[PDB]
Ligand binder design. Structure first.
Ligand SMILES: *[C@@H]1O[C@H](CO)[C@@H](O[C@@H]2O[C@H](CO)[C@@H](O)[C@H](O)[C@H]2NC(C)=O)[C@H](O)[C@H]1NC(C)=O
Ligand SMILES: *[C@@H]1O[C@H](CO)[C@@H](O)[C@H](O)[C@H]1NC(C)=O
Ligand SMILES: *[C@@H]1O[C@H](CO)[C@@H](O)[C@H](O)[C@H]1NC(C)=O
Length: 752
DNA sequence: CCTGGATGGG
């Protein structure tokens, strides 16, 4: 059977996906098609500029419709093409089950007639400049209205978006409203008191007072930021907030007892008026980023009485000249008893010390601390020891330089105490730096210029440490006692550390890897390991090893010295040998890899032959990756029976032919990637029988030979369930006037 | 609100 919704793709949760197919209009699907199954239709970034009553009229259970970027207004078109979308008047009424609709980045100047089942309506970056009681009349179920971007630089209009007083009163269930980037100077008048999220940011509302939020007592989130900006570090156009502005009257927000979030970022504030935050019992999030409060936060009392607050953002409150604030936190920070996350990155200051963060020190739930990009040069890392509930500290992108004078490398997210000092200016690591941080589980020291000797002396205090990311440095040699001072180390990143000249006439000693009873994950990626090095990695504990970006080729080219170089890794699971220039492979080299291997990568090497009869020597292999190599064929022995294989990636080769039955004996094989190759066809004789047993079979980007009527078509229809993107991303290489078109296209739908 | 640090998403 043809795929039902050609040229579109059916997908989980009744999603017809028509995105990105260059469509001039909406597909009228066949009568055969299960239209009752379609609960969501997606036509993103096609070029549909005309909508008709008959378009979605037969989609009885349709609830989600996405027509975004179909007719971009002049401003938003790369080439400034004007576009105006005509919509027939019953276009949407014909869809009485419709619940959500995205009309954004389209050329419409008025709202269409919409059905009363609508619940969410997006009209962002359209040309509607007027909203009054007639626009959305009777949308009683409508909870979400978003209309951002209808009048600003990328899509201008010569005046302010008009929202008549009480335009939206009719929407008695509306709880969410977005009207950013619309060139408003005042907050509309009498918005639905049902509202819970009002976002009026990035307009030109320079004056606010209680009158403006009259009757809006259900607000839980309010964003009025960006309305009078500092424009010295953008990027795009920007009206500078004029001299004696903004003007927030002290009790502007006083009556919003239920309010949980308040955003005043980029509002040209020099002072905090504590009367703003009075009455705000339930405030959990406050965003003061991008103002001028360097001076205010050494002395302010406006945080007195914000007890429930959990996230406070102060990032980018720097002196506009680009210089240091001198910094102690006002003691009222101490009143933020519920504080969980404090953002202070990009304020710019010189010294981190006990004074600096004093009132915070004993806040009991403070967990996260963003201090990056602050150009600090004197840190006192010990101040942090007794913080009761710390877990993450971002101190990257500063100028600290000492004390005071994923399958292959897991993330530190679930871990309990983490310190990132990356992109600092450390040349050498003192052990005493880490005197007070024995509780650390993760230490990120990448992208310094660390050119020291590791010998066991460097990380002595760090006896809880499990993750040590030392990548992107110049670590000058590796010894038998390196990292042994870290008893509990579970994962170690030594990638991008290449000093082949500063070696002192010798090479790395890698025995230390044997000396680390906790170690699972190790990266030596891109270290340029050419020669002169240990002959056996041994570890009874190691689960995964990244060797990508070195020169295993060189090593195995050199006699039988390094042919057991991975053998000692008795526990191994994963091994990345990508980008090692491997031009060839001995049957003797592949038997010498740990019997336990489950995942193996060989991406981007120059292998043009590969002995599949030798996968018997890896009785546990489940995944093998040969992507981006030089294979002319899948031949020279087929896939041996018994093999446990599940994922085979041979993408980006030059496979022009496969021998019959190759994949047949691969009984467990569930994922196959033959994409980007020289395949003129696709045969079932390759899979013996067992065709519809694969779950994912990728044959896109192949010069398929669409001859009326070729033999890959029966096979692919018959297993379509496993061919991702069969309806459009599987394409003809030939003949001529089908080149680059889909194997189903208008001159092939007449030959099936 | 989320996201970054600029802006666009829901
Ligand atoms: C099969 O491999 C191909 C190419 O190796 C994959 O196609 C790429 O997909 C990645 C994302 O996973 C993108 O970075 C690229 O844009 C894609 N490139 C091309 C040319 O298509 C493909 O994803 C793999 N197949 C499957 C099902 O994952
Ligand atoms: C915003 O409104 C002002 C005042 O009427 C107008 O002069 C300006 O051009 C408008 N901005 C845009 C981007 O259309
Ligand atoms: C590696 O480990 C130890 C240093 O702790 C040393 O005694 C041994 O000789 C080293 N091996 C090589 C081959 O350099």
């Amino acid at each position: 059977t043809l795929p039902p919704f050609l040229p579109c793709e059916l997908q989980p949760h009744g999603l017809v996906n028509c995105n990105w197919l260059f469509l001039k209009s909406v597909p009228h699907f066949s009568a055969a098609a299960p239209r009752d199954n379609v609960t969501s239709l997606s036509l993103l970034s096609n070029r549909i500029h005309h909508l008709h009553d008959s378009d979605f009229a037969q989609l009885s259970n349709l609830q989600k419709l996405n027509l975004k970027w179909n007719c971009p207004p002049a401003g938003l078109s790369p080439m400034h093409f004007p576009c105006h979308m005509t919509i027939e008047p019953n276009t949407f009424l014909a869809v009485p089950t419709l619940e959500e609709l995205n009309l954004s980045y389209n050329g419409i100047t008025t709202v269409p007639a919409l059905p009363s089942s609508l619940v969410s309506l997006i009209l962002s970056r359209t040309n509607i400049l007027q909203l009054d009681p007639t626009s959305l009349t009777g949308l009683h179920a409508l909870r979400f209205l978003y209309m951002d971007g209808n009048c600003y630089y990328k899509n201008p209009c010569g005046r302010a978006l008009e929202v008549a007083p009480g335009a939206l009163l009719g929407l008695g269930n509306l709880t969410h409203l977005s009207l950013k980037y619309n060139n408003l100077t005042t907050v509309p008048r009498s918005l639905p008191p049902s509202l819970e999220y009002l976002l009026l940011s990035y307009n030109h509302i320079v004056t606010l007072a209680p009158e403006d939020l009259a009757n809006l007592t259900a607000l839980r989130v309010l964003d009025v930021g960006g309305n009078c900006r500092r424009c010295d570090h953008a990027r795009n156009p920007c009206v500078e907030c004029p001299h004696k502005f903004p003007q927030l009257h002290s009790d502007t927000f006083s009556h919003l007892s239920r309010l949980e979030g308040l955003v005043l970022k980029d509002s040209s504030l020099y002072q905090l008026n504590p009367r703003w935050f009075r009455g705000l019992g339930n405030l959990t999030v406050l965003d003061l980023s991008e103002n001028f409060l360097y001076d205010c936060i050494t002395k302010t009392k406006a945080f007195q009485g914000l007890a429930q607050l959990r996230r406070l953002n102060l990032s980018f409150n720097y002196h506009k000249k680009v210089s240091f604030a001198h910094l102690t936190l006002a003691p009222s920070f101490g009143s933020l008893l519920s504080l969980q996350e404090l953002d202070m990155h990009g304020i710019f200051f010189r010294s981190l010390s006990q004074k600096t963060l004093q009132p915070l020190a004993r806040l009991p739930m403070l967990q996260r601390l963003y201090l990056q990009m602050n150009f600090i040069n004197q840190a006192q890392l010990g101040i942090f020891k007794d913080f009761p509930g710390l877990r993450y500290i971002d101190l990257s992108d500063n100028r600290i330089s000492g004390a005071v004078e994923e399958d292959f490398m897991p993330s530190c997210k679930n871990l309990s105490f983490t310190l990132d000092l990356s992109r600092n200016n450390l040349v050498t690591v003192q052990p005493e730096m880490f005197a007070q941080l024995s509780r650390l589980q993760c230490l990120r020291l990448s992208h310094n210029s660390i050119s020291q000797a590791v010998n066991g002396s460097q990380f002595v205090p760090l006896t809880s440490l499990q993750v040590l990311d030392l990548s992107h440095n110049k670590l000058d040699l590796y010894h038998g006692r390196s990292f042994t001072e870290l008893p509990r180390l579970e994962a170690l990143d030594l990638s991008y550390n290449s000093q082949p000249f500063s070696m002192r006439g010798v090479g790395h000693n890698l025995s230390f890897v044997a000396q680390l009873p906790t170690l699972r994950y190790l990266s030596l990626a891109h270290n340029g390991i050419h020669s002169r090095v240990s002959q056996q990695l041994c570890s009874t504990s190691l689960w995964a090893l990244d060797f990508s970006g070195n020169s295993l080729s060189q090593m195995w080219a050199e006699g039988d010295l390094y042919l057991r170089f991975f053998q000692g890794l008795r526990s191994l699971i994963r091994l990345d040998l990508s980008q090692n220039r491997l031009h060839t492979l001995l049957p003797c080299t592949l038997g010498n890899l740990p019997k336990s291997l489950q995942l193996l990568r060989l991406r981007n090497n120059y292998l043009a032959f590969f002995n599949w009869s030798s996968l018997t020597l890896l009785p546990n292999l489940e995944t093998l990756d040969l992507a981006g190599n030089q294979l002319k064929a899948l031949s020279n022995g087929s896939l041996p029976s018994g093999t446990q294989l599940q994922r085979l990636d041979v993408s980006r080769n030059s496979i022009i032919f496969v021998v019959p039955g190759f994949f047949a004996l691969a009984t467990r094989l569930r994922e196959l990637n033959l994409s980007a190759n020289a395949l003129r066809t696709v045969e079932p004789s390759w899979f013996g029988f067992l065709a519809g047993s694969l779950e994912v079979l990728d044959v896109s980007a192949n010069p398929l030979h669409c001859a009326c009527g070729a033999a890959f078509v029966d096979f692919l229809l018959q297993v379509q369930a496993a061919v991702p993107g069969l309806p459009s991303r599987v394409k003809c290489g030939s003949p001529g006037q089908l080149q680059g078109r889909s194997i189903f296209a208008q001159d092939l739908r007449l030959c099936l």
